[PDB]
Amino acid sequence: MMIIDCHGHYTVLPKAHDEWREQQKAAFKAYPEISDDEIRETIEANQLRLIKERGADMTIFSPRASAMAPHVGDQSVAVPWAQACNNLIARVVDLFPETFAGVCMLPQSPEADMTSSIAELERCVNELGFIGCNLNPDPGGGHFKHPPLTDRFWYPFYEKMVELDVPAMIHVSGSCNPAMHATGAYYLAADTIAFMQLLQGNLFADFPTLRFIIPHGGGAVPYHWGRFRGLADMLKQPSLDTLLMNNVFFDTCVYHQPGINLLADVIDNKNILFGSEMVGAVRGIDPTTGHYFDDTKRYIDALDISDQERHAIFEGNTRRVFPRLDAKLKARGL
Amino acid sequence: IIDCHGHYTVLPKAHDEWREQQKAAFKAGQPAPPYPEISDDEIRETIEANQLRLIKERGADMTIFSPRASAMAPHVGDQSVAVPWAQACNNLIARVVDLFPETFAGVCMLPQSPEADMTSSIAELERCVNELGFIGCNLNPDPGGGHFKHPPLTDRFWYPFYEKMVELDVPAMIHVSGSCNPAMHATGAYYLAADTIAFMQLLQGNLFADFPTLRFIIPHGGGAVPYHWGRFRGLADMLKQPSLDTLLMNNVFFDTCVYHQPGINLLADVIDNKNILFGSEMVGAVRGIDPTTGHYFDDTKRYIDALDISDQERHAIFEGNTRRVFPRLDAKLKARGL
Numbered sequence A: 001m002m003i004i005d006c007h008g009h010y011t012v013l014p015k016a017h018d019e020w021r022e023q024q025k026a027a028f029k030a031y032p033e034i035s036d037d038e039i040r041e042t043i044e045a046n047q048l049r050l051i052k053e054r055g056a057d058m059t060i061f062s063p064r065a066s067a068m069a070p071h072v073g074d075q076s077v078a079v080p081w082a083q084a085c086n087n088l089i090a091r092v093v094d095l096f097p098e099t100f101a102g103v104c105m106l107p108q109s110p111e112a113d114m115t116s117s118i119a120e121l122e123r124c125v126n127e128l129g130f131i132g133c134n135l136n137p138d139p140g141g142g143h144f145k146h147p148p149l150t151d152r153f154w155y156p157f158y159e160k161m162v163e164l165d166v167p168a169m170i171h172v173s174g175s176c177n178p179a180m181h182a183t184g185a186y187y188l189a190a191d192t193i194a195f196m197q198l199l200q201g202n203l204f205a206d207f208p209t210l211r212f213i214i215p216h217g218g219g220a221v222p223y224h225w226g227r228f229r230g231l232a233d234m235l236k237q238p239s240l241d242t243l244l245m246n247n248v249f250f251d252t253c254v255y256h257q258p259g260i261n262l263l264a265d266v267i268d269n270k271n272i273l274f275g276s277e278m279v280g281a282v283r284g285i286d287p288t289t290g291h292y293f294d295d296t297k298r299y300i301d302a303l304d305i306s307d308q309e310r311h312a313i314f315e316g317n318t319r320r321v322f323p324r325l326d327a328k329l330k331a332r333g334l
Numbered sequence B: 001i002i003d004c005h006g007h008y009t010v011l012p013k014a015h016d017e018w019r020e021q022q023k024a025a026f027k028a029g030q031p032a033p034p035y036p037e038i039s040d041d042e043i044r045e046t047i048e049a050n051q052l053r054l055i056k057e058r059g060a061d062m063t064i065f066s067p068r069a070s071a072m073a074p075h076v077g078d079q080s081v082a083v084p085w086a087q088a089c090n091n092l093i094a095r096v097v098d099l100f101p102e103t104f105a106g107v108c109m110l111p112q113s114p115e116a117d118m119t120s121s122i123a124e125l126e127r128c129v130n131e132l133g134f135i136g137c138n139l140n141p142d143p144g145g146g147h148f149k150h151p152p153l154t155d156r157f158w159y160p161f162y163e164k165m166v167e168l169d170v171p172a173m174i175h176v177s178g179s180c181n182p183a184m185h186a187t188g189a190y191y192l193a194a195d196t197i198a199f200m201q202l203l204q205g206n207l208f209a210d211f212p213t214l215r216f217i218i219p220h221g222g223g224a225v226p227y228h229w230g231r232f233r234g235l236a237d238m239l240k241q242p243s244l245d246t247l248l249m250n251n252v253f254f255d256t257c258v259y260h261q262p263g264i265n266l267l268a269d270v271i272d273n274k275n276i277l278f279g280s281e282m283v284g285a286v287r288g289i290d291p292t293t294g295h296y297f298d299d300t301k302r303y304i305d306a307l308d309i310s311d312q313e314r315h316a317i318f319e320g321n322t323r324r325v326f327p328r329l330d331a332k333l334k335a336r337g338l
């Protein structure tokens, strides 16, 4: 079985990229040339080394999430940034095509509809060979002032996803809200809110093939699985298994064994996708284990499950959720 | 067996009716109508049919009891509404407490509104604690109702209120109310996000250096926190902050309002025993049976019961921890020779 990591961002970048970013905002408040060897550098010393150390084969790789910051920022700012962030990913893929597959950030901004986003999706899937995207449920950056995912506002975009046969990870970005830390508060809240928004309507009755990944082990959701099943009856809604769990998936970016145990316990096997978000939110060693918080393969490994279960989690669920990756690997005879 | 989280949810019908007339008069710039005469037995009926019925069946002894949280609705509208509403809501709890003083202890809602400082909440805290003998309050981190637009709990906007809490030796349950944000359901999303956000606000600063004996309960088993304990421990280092045990966990406690065994399993596993306070939030967020067990979602005693813990651990969860976090309740119980 292949070990595919479904959650990863290019987090250690050539300086020039981020400096241009700041000057963009400064020329707004009022692009650099990067070499192959610079990118080879940033990736060899970081993700490529850890993949090797940790026994992984592939990582589904997108732009640093907290740097998307669509709230800057109108459509004239977001488009070029989203294009350049995604162009960097396609070069990382180019350079390491057996190791990275591309997921794209969208040029969302607080005031725009999904037109440009539909355009970058097509450019990335159709011309850059990308396999999925990251979808930001709150481009404003901290106050959740966008319409819930059940809103028709988002529909033309899902029509594209469904045309291209590509899933989306629900993923907010950096916070412009002093009351809200990003990787420790905003990210987990959005995971939960996004799940609950879907439990309120019935989106997948309209798009039965639409697939979402809710990162970080679904936020608070599996921990409160009892609460959510119970709210389905409170709201007169269909059960979570029929309403959501053919279309909603959770990664295993939960950085400790007990959390990983609960995830495997209450959530069905087909809904769990191996992911680790390495070199990201939490980079240090765990003082209680001697192993890195984000070396999540270790937690899956220590589970007491069958090969059939381990395989789905490490390879098969992800190839199901990402059809365009499954076909890329089938073509390589894998 | 002391339930640290319960709300007066099934209420005399006149109270609910007044509230609607109150908001209706405010929206039309008119005087609010007189608050209705509610009979002792009107209150008795509601408690006897619901909370008391369930306490007995479940073998609890008492509940720390507060107004219905989703009804607090501080985003409706200004102080001229918030103050009379809160006073009225807390008076009912005080009446419930008078009629069943062996069973319920009072915790108060605050007259928080989006445009006000905490001056009026300090006063109501004083009223209920000094005059009405309540043992705590519910502190709302986002009176704005769904957009998290207030300052974090670390901000000195909250400091004068914190001083009053220390003076009276009372804890606060961090708790939001209804949502005005269509992107955010109250009990399934807002409440949980609120818990998680409150915890990270604390992780970022060091409020308990300034107030060594300030005490917060983060409800619903700590939101996403225990499930993500490793992420939070790691985040402390990413932030070059002290360890959670020292930074937060002598001042922060979680309830057991987790509505399935596996969740209660994780909570006991990862959180120190002294930080866990039995609660159930009965007749509230989730009121039906769990098709997979044949038992009620919120009958949380059943989950603690199934834990392979010692008699001492159980005692702390059901009785000991709560008595430490609410000294006034502790003192009241001692005075009764318990």
Ligand SMILES: O=C(O)C[C@@](O)(CC(=O)C(=O)O)C(=O)O
Pocket (backbone or CB within 6 Å): A009, A011, A064, A065, A066, A067, A182, A183, A187, A215, A277, A279, A280, A281
């Ligand atoms: O930027 C970081 O260092 C952290 C991080 O990679 C974290 C992140 O994306 C996640 O927690 O899923 C981010 O982009 O925000």
Ligand SMILES: O=C(O)C[C@@](O)(CC(=O)C(=O)O)C(=O)O
Pocket (backbone or CB within 6 Å): B007, B009, B067, B068, B069, B070, B071, B187, B191, B219, B281, B283, B284, B285
């Ligand atoms: O409104 C209700 O009945 C639900 C509820 O009881 C829920 C609640 O308070 C909680 O889950 O903590 C409330 O008061 O908000």
Ligand SMILES: [Zn+2]
Pocket (backbone or CB within 6 Å): A007, A008, A009, A065, A171, A215, A277
């Ligand atoms: Zn991420």
Ligand SMILES: [Zn+2]
Pocket (backbone or CB within 6 Å): B005, B007, B069, B175, B219, B281
């Ligand atoms: Zn509550």
